[model samples]
Target: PTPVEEAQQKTIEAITKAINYMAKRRIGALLTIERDTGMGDYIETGIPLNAKVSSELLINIFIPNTPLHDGAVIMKNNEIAAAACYLPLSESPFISKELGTRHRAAVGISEVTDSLTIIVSEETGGVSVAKNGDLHRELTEEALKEMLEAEF
Candidate 1:
């Protein structure tokens, strides 16, 4: 495998583990992995962390009721760029009424950037991926890996 492919697979594996942990703990989470588009303004909205990304860090960030847990995390170059990041909420008429702010914010960010947003639903332990203004809900291991492959 190419160096890039190996790196991508590593990230996919790490995040999948974090998401699985969050689901079992009933911790809601929103994570944005940067793609092509710039997110300068978006990044500025949160506190800078600039730490290397890992499953442990991601899991800690999403633990319920933690100060940083409510907002989103922005990842760039496989590193945590910011935490408690405020994202725009989508106003699309088609957005499901059942979805909450976290899901809306995920969609909103996707609408503006080429980022892929991953969401873990606290109420359902369900996982979803949002990209290009669309949500792919309850993704399996293979589906989540496939989506991460496109972004990483």
Candidate 2:
């Protein structure tokens, strides 16, 4: 593999580890990895962390009863921008009624920007991805890892 591929794979591995833990423990989370678009306004809604992204930090942020556990985390340039950030929910009439705020918000952000979102459901502990105004729901461990590798 090329150096870039190796780096991306390592990143995917770290994220997948966190996702696995969250799924097993039923801890919900929303992770928005920024792409080409600049989301300065949205980032302002969150309390800034400006920390290097890590599986442990992401997992800890999503702890069942922890503070700032409910909103999304925005990552950019391989670093975490902020945590507990609020995002706009999809007001589109086409969204599935079964999707909760997390999914809707994921889609909403993707609708406006080039960002991709990762959502972990609290009830089912299922993984989902949102990008380009579309959602890939109930992704498996390998599938999620693959998608992250491709996107990154």
Candidate 3:
């Protein structure tokens, strides 16, 4: 495989592992994985990690009751670029009130940048993705993989 394809494969695996773990335990998390767009401005607000993305690291950072679990984790170039990053909340009237801050933030970021966000709902352990200001909810593992593969 080419270098880019290899990197994409590793990223997909790492993300899948993290998402699976979070979904099984109902751990709420918002992960923004950067694509063509650069989100340095938003990531600068949070703590910089520059660590490689792994299931263990992602899980530890996002575990409930942790200090860094409140905000979003930003991934760039297949790395955990930052944690606890603040994202702009969407003011769109179309969003349902039933959704919380995480969903809004996910959509909010997507509106400005070409980034893909994965959200794990604590209330229902459902997996969702936000892309281009559109939210796809309750995705199965196969569906999620298809999305990732298409994007990467």
TM-score top scorer: 3
Report the Cα lDDT for candidate 3.
0.92
Q: Which residue segments of model 3 deviate by more than 4 Å?
A: none
Models 1 onward score TM values of: 0.93, 0.91, 0.96
Clashing pairs in 1: none
Of candidate 3, the 10-residue stretch with the lowest lDDT total is 90-99
What does the lDDT read for residue 68 in candidate 1? 81
**Best first by lDDT, ranked:** 3, 1, 2
> Which residue pairs collide in model 2, if any?
none
Q: Write the per-residue lDDT of candidate 1 for residues 1-152, one digit (tens) a residue.
A: 99978777777888889988887776899999888897878888998999888999999888877788878999887788999999999987666789899999999999998899999888898889888999889887678877777665
Shift of residue 140 alpha carbon in model 3, Å: 0.4
Candidate 3 lDDT over 1-152, as tens digits, reads 99989988988998999899999999999999999989999899999999988888999999989889988999997899999999989887766678899989999999999999999999899999999988889999989989999987
Write one digit per residue (lDDT tens) for candidate 2, span 35-119.
8999878888998999876889889988978887888999876677998898889887666687799889999998999988999
Evaluate model 1: give its TM-score. Answer: 0.93
lDDT of 2: 0.86
